[PDB]
Amino acid sequence: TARFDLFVVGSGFFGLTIAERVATQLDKRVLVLERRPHIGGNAYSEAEPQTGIEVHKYGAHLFHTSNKRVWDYVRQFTDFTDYRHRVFAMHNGQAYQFPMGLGLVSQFFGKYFTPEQARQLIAEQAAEIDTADAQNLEEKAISLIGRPLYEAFVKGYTAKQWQTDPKELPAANITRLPVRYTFDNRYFSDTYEGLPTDGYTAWLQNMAADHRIEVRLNTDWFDVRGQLRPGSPAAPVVYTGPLDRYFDYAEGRLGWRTLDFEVEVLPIGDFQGTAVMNYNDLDVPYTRIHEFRHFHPERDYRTDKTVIMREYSRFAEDDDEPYYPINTEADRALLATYRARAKSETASSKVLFGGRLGTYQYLDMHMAIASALNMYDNVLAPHLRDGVPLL
Amino acid sequence: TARFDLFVVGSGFFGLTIAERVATQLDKRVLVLERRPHIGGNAYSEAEPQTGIEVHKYGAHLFHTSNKRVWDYVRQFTDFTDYRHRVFAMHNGQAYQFPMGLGLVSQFFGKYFTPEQARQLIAEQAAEIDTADAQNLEEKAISLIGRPLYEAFVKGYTAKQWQTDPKELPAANITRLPVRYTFDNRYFSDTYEGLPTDGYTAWLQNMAADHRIEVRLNTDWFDVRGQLRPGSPAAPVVYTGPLDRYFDYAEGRLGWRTLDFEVEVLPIGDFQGTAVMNYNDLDVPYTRIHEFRHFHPERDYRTDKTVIMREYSRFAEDDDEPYYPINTEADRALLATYRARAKSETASSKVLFGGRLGTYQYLDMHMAIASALNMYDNVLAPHLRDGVPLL
Numbered sequence: 131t132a133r134f135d136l137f138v139v140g141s142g143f144f145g146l147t148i149a150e151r152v153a154t155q156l157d158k159r160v161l162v163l164e165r166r167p168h169i170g171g172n173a174y175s176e177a178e179p180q181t182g183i184e185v186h187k188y189g190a191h192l193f194h195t196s197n198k199r200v201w202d203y204v205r206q207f208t209d210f211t212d213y214r215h216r217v218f219a220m221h222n223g224q225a226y227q228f229p230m231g232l233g234l235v236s237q238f239f240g241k242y243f244t245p246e247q248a249r250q251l252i253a254e255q256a257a258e259i260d261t262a263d264a265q266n267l268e269e270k271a272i273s274l275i276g277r278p279l280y281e282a283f284v285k286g287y288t289a290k291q292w293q294t295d296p297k298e299l300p301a302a303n304i305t306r307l308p309v310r311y312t313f314d315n316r317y318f319s320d321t322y323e324g325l326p327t328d329g330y331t332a333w334l335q336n337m338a339a340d341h342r343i344e345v346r347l348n349t350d351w352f353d354v355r356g357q358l359r360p361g362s363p364a365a366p367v368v369y370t371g372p373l374d375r376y377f378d379y380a381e382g383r384l385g386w387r388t389l390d391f392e393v394e395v396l397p398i399g400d401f402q403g404t405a406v407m408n409y410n411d412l413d414v415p416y417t418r419i420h421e422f423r424h425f426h427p428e429r430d431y432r433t434d435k436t437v438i439m440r441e442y443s444r445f446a447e448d449d450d451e452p453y454y455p456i457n458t459e460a461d462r463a464l465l466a467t468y469r470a471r472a473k474s475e476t477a478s479s480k481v482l483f484g485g486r487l488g489t490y491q492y493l494d495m496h497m498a499i500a501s502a503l504n505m506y507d508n509v510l511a512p513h514l515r516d517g518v519p520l521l
Numbered sequence: 522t523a524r525f526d527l528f529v530v531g532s533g534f535f536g537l538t539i540a541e542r543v544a545t546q547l548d549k550r551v552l553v554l555e556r557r558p559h560i561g562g563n564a565y566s567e568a569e570p571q572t573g574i575e576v577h578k579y580g581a582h583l584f585h586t587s588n589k590r591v592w593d594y595v596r597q598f599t600d601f602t603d604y605r606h607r608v609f610a611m612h613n614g615q616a617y618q619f620p621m622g623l624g625l626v627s628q629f630f631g632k633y634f635t636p637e638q639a640r641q642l643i644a645e646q647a648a649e650i651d652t653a654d655a656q657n658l659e660e661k662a663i664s665l666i667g668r669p670l671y672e673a674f675v676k677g678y679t680a681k682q683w684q685t686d687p688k689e690l691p692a693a694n695i696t697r698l699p700v701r702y703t704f705d706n707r708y709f710s711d712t713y714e715g716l717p718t719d720g721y722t723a724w725l726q727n728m729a730a731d732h733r734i735e736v737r738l739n740t741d742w743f744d745v746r747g748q749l750r751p752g753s754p755a756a757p758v759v760y761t762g763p764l765d766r767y768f769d770y771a772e773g774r775l776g777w778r779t780l781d782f783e784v785e786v787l788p789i790g791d792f793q794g795t796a797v798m799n800y801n802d803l804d805v806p807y808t809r810i811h812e813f814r815h816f817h818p819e820r821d822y823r824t825d826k827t828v829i830m831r832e833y834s835r836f837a838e839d840d841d842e843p844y845y846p847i848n849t850e851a852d853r854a855l856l857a858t859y860r861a862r863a864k865s866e867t868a869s870s871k872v873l874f875g876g877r878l879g880t881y882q883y884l885d886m887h888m889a890i891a892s893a894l895n896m897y898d899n900v901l902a903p904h905l906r907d908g909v910p911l912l
């Protein structure tokens with residue numbers, strides 16, 4: 131009678147987490163529908179033929195979390211390396227330590243500042259706004275690093291990445307970056323961090339490995355939901371695609387940013403001597419450059435070639451794949467509307483919304499996985515197992 | 522009849538490794554004689570009363586090795602943290618990335634150099650000498666980092682640390698430092714690295730914990746060897762004290778360097794924002810400064826106080842404790858003599874020589890432990906177990 135117990139739209143970390151938990155902990159059959167030719171969403175990786183180096187096809191993916199439960203969960207499917215992510219910043223022909231630390235300060239200001247002297251210097255340069263009263267990105271950034279540093283490393287980068295007035299961008303975007311007064315130049319500040327030892331695709335394939343999970347690549351949910359759902363009428367639907375696209379943009383177009391990549395194999399062994407180099411100056415079109423050999427130093431790749439990737443940012447069109455939610459005031463207002471329509475869809479046909487795209491949220495991998503675990507624990511499992519309504 | 526099966530002089534890592542292996546693997550009674558009030562030699566650590574921060578009393582101790590067997594052995598007695606040692610260098614009022622890397626190069630030379638451009642620049646500045654033909658420290662350093670960088674970060678530091686012409690110092694001293702053309706500023710380049718989770722003293726106390734091992738603090742071997750050895754005539758002696766001091770300096774005085782430390786608790790939470798800051802300029806008397814809170818960031822120490830330690834270097838006197846072997850041509854010549862007298866002592870009264878002091882070798886912890894394992898495997902064990910002579 132009932133073919134599946136649950137439909138999941140999208141095979142990203144949210145979708146796979148949901149699909150894995152349901153199938154493995156509740157002994158239920160889950161159908162996962164993926165539009166792309168591969169699973170894993172933007173986390174999908176692929177070895178470059180010439181060099182053998184693993185390439186994060188949709189931009190650099192670095193896993194990190196302070197959530198012990200998430201860390202323990204993800205380690206069920208993959209090992210993690212010793213890698214600690216660091217970023218350098220290119221400004222006026224000089225490579226700077228990054229982000230905010232004694233390294234960045236001493237370089238940019240020409241002399242060594244003690245932790246105490248550094249705190250005083252920034253406090254002076256952050257006088258025009260206090261951190262608590264920070265409404266947007268521009269105000270919050272200046273309140274944390276000061277206007278001179280904001281001018282040189284934030285204002286330009288933010289322009290290329292968003293093409294939106296920094297006074298209209300959320301403050302949460304800039305607070306993704308740690309603000310320190312030590313020489314610690316770790317780009318993240320979570321307890322647990324590392325790269326998947328055998329790569330991202332292996333990790334992802336292990337999450338969807340269970341026999342009760344079926345994944346259909348090259349399949350849009352909208353093309354087949356008419357045919358599928360009557361086959362399993364009681365089965366709920368977890369949707370992780372673009373939230374506005376789901377309702378045919380009937381309330382308006384949410385602001386998204388999309389990315390274009392240029393992948394190039396170079397006849398030299400080392401291009402920039404580090405994994406990610408940010409480009410903060412507007413005299414260059416790309417936001418940053420990835421050199422993927424530096425992601426996995428524990429592996430010994432060939433030393434005569436190397437793979438680099440330039441990252442370009444622009445507004446997402448109707449045919450584009452959305453990467454970043456812009457989340458301006460207008461966007462947040464429009465989101466509130468779709469939230470209501472999504473809330474209605476949950477009660478009318480048991481359709482759930484989650485993930486970066488499904489919630490218009492600037493989510494990372496760990497945040498997406500944690501979110502999926504919460505939806506499983508508090509919503510999905512009680513429904514599928516104990517009959518409880520989804521609301 | 523026979524009280525002990527082996528005498529060990531000195532409770533450093535060599536001595537303890539020897540004592541542990543013999544007692545634990547051969548079921549033999551070992552007496553360890555320590556002159557100091559504590560075990561562990563220079564690796565002894567101690568919590569500072571006000572702050573609670575662990576202080577490496579005899580200078581910063583960072584464990585690292587590429588030897589899998591050593592790593593597996595030491596982990597039997599302690600856990601290791603995630604710590605990766607990094608050093609910054611102070612020169613003309615600016616804090617530099619260190620050692621040789623794209624960080625140091627781009628800072629000191631004012632602009633960003635690509636890995637390829639960096640290799641070319643140094644090759645030009647290292648033209649006066651090729652690395653293979655490097656006889657001493659000065660020549661080897663210039664051949665690896667170039668004369669301008671040698672002038673600014675090596676020549677001055679080496680003067681304060683050795684007070685000896687760099688043309689008379691061994692090349693092995695400068696090759697302790699990694700030479701890179703990436704942004705990797707890890708001060709070491711071994712596979713395994715970290716700090717003892719519960720501190721060095723706990724680690725050391727676990728190695729000497731066995732009931733067949735007796736350690737006598739506050740005891741000089743020379744004071745009691747007359748009384749002890751007839752109590753166990755068949756028992757060999759492993760000596761890890763100063764090699765020249767053993768023979769009453771009868772062949773001459775080996776050149777040593779000793780260290781003086783200044784420990785100060787400051788009413789601020791952070792002094793330099795990093796564990797070790799080198800001071801390469803001669804306008805300051807100390808070689809470097811340690812801030813021990815940065816050694817263990819995983820621990821949460823108080824943020825209103827901090828412990829720092831200034832390191833001063835000088836020649837070791839007859840009453841001083843030797844830290845570094847200088848190993849000049851004259852020193853190596855004198856060492857050859859003591860080697861012969863030591864070789865004679867092995868055949869006349871079964872006295873072995875090992876460790877940093879006992880062999881006049883610039884040894885690290887892992888090298889000292891590896892050395893002790895080799896002496897156990899190839900010399901001590903066959904003797905104590907299979908009667909084989911020590912030669």
Ligand SMILES: Cc1cc2nc3c(=O)[nH]c(=O)nc-3n(C[C@H](O)[C@H](O)[C@H](O)COP(=O)(O)OP(=O)(O)OC[C@H]3O[C@@H](n4cnc5c(N)ncnc54)[C@H](O)[C@@H]3O)c2cc1C
Nearest residue numbers: 140142143144165171189191192351371485486493494495
């Ligand atoms: C450039 C970049 C770098 C990042 N780096 C990091 C990092 O270093 N560390 C970190 O923790 N996070 C990072 N992130 C964030 C992270 O990638 C996201 O959290 C992650 O993609 C979460 O997956 P998601 O489940 O929200 O689904 P997503 O992976 O965003 O994709 C889900 C899938 O849904 C599918 N789909 C959509 N619509 C349909 C449909 N109609 N029918 C069928 N399938 C559909 C898509 O094919 C897509 O594959 C980065 C993001 C970007 C853009």
Ligand SMILES: Cc1cc2nc3c(=O)[nH]c(=O)nc-3n(C[C@H](O)[C@H](O)[C@H](O)COP(=O)(O)OP(=O)(O)OC[C@H]3O[C@@H](n4cnc5c(N)ncnc54)[C@H](O)[C@@H]3O)c2cc1C
Nearest residue numbers: 531533534535556562580582583742762876877884885886
């Ligand atoms: C400032 C400094 C920093 C260092 N940092 C590192 C580091 O970061 N990482 C690393 O791997 N290595 C480091 N080292 C090197 C390391 O400390 C040595 O390898 C280590 O001390 C090895 O111990 P050892 O067994 O050779 O004996 P040592 O520890 O040098 O001491 C042995 C003991 O013999 C005892 N003794 C001597 N004579 C007598 C006697 N007549 N009677 C009784 N007892 C005697 C002494 O009391 C002494 O305690 C550092 C060394 C110094 C000086």
Ligand SMILES: O=c1ccn([C@@H]2O[C@H](COP(=O)(O)OP(=O)(O)O[C@H]3O[C@@H]([C@H](O)CO)C(F)(F)C3(F)F)[C@@H](O)[C@H]2O)c(=O)[nH]1
Nearest residue numbers: 190191192217283284285287288291303304306406408418
């Ligand atoms: O140099 C910078 C870096 C960030 N920012 C601002 O901060 C915002 C968020 O930065 P964030 O680094 O998290 O951007 P992201 O693409 O979401 O993060 C990604 O950036 C990669 C890389 O290490 C860093 O270059 C990454 F690892 F893939 C990432 F962190 F996921 C960004 O939109 C900018 O407005 C700057 O202004 N300047």
Ligand SMILES: O=c1ccn([C@@H]2O[C@H](COP(=O)(O)OP(=O)(O)O[C@H]3O[C@@H]([C@H](O)CO)C(F)(F)C3(F)F)[C@@H](O)[C@H]2O)c(=O)[nH]1
Nearest residue numbers: 581582583608674675676678679682694695697797799809
């Ligand atoms: O900045 C430097 C550093 C080293 N050198 C030269 O290199 C030689 C050896 O250096 P090395 O760092 O191993 O000296 P060491 O005291 O044996 O090493 C110790 O130095 C500590 C710290 O991190 C680095 O400041 C340490 F960790 F404790 C150490 F590595 F054990 C030194 O004698 C100098 O001649 C310089 O010229 N300049």
